[PDB]
């Protein structure tokens, strides 16, 4: 009956920064995933655990769509068993992942001529993220022994770093909007 609000997820004007990735629970609706896979706007479309064409057949309790913006080179990190800044301190997928990872270039939307600084990623953390955990704290990261009294300094770094997105950057440094469907049963 009701159609799944996938238009509001893939086609939204604004995408959250990766460190504060936005999750939108989707339920009580019917969607066609086959046309999603055969679309031409999606440069990257990986499905783990379930084949793309069988999605519309199987029934799932809930579907979560996490959306964010990362660099082009960091798209490989959105996958089970990966390491790096994104897969450790910003967005971590479980090893037993059951879902699809969709990404497409959004250089025209998410770049600025002088550099777009509205997209940030966590750069340090006291420990690796557990799967599907969001950390939006902006407390100063203490990399040494002396306590950082909320002030940047020696061995005291601000964890959030902003992507410098410009339309002239190479492909590996252009923003990519990523949507990660996660099927839970």
């Amino acid at each position, epitope marked *: 009956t009701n159609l799944c609000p996938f238009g509001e997820v893939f086609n939204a004007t604004r995408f959250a920064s990766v460190y504060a990735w936005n999750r939108k629970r989707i339920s009580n609706c019917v969607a066609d995933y086959s046309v999603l896979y055969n679309s031409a706007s999606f440069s990257t479309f990986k499905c783990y655990g379930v084949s793309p064409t069988k999605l519309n057949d199987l029934c799932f309790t809930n579907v979560y769509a996490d959306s964010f913006v990362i660099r082009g080179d960091e798209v490989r990190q959105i996958a089970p068993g990966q390491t790096g800044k994104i897969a450790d301190y910003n967005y971590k997928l479980p090893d037993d992942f059951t879902g699809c990872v969709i990404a497409w270039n959004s250089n025209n939307l998410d770049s600025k001529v002088g550099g777009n*600084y509205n997209y940030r990623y966590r750069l340090f953390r006291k420990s690796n993220l557990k799967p599907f955990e969001r950390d939006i704290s902006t407390e100063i990261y203490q990399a*040494g022994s002396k306590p950082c*009294n909320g*002030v*940047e*300094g*020696f061995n005291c770094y*601000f964890p959030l770093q902003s992507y410098g997105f410009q339309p002239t950057n190479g492909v590996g440094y252009q923003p990519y909007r990523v949507v990660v469907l996660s099927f839970e049963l």
Partner: antibody
Amino acid sequence: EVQLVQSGAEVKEPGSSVKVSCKASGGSFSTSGISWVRQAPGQGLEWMGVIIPIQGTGNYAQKFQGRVTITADESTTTVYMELSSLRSDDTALYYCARDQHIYDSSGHGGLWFDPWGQGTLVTVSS
Amino acid sequence: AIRMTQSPSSLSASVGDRVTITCRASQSISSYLNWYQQKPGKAPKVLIYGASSLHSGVPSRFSGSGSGTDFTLTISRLQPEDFATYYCQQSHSSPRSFGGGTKVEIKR
């Protein structure tokens, strides 16, 4: 680089409060610290406090704690410092400056205040 | 709670000479030292950050060195526009304590 513009001069009386604005031209707001440095006439520089706008709050030196409040208006890209309980010793130029903090991998390289405001001469008298 | 001590507070030097300014810390600050130049009626400007790096646009005659608790700003060849007040600041931890400041005047 980024350009910083402050408000105009103020004349106040002891026990009052003064609010000084510092509008950043832009470029890395909400993640760049805006430090406030004051300079008494004929004296040395002195660091009051810093704010990183996304934090929301502000951190101050252990000499202005309790009577300096630093806040940020993200929409207007302006940083406000409110120094309450003014006295005779608060007559000074008040600069707003931006932090940089380039660190390589071990502690090499430090913070510095590359852009500075023109200065907001605040005079306390009667 | 780290203090900085400059020396001297006021030196006289002629154009083209060599000027040496020392900045010493109460305890070790690694390499988190800066040097600022202030001319009358104007905001301070950066010369050295990280104790050894030059800001973009700084003339190469300025040079900084040192680490730990002993630092030095050196001007190889003084210029008529180099007579100002030089402050050393430690960025190690709050409060970033500026030095007393050294005023370079025209020797005559």
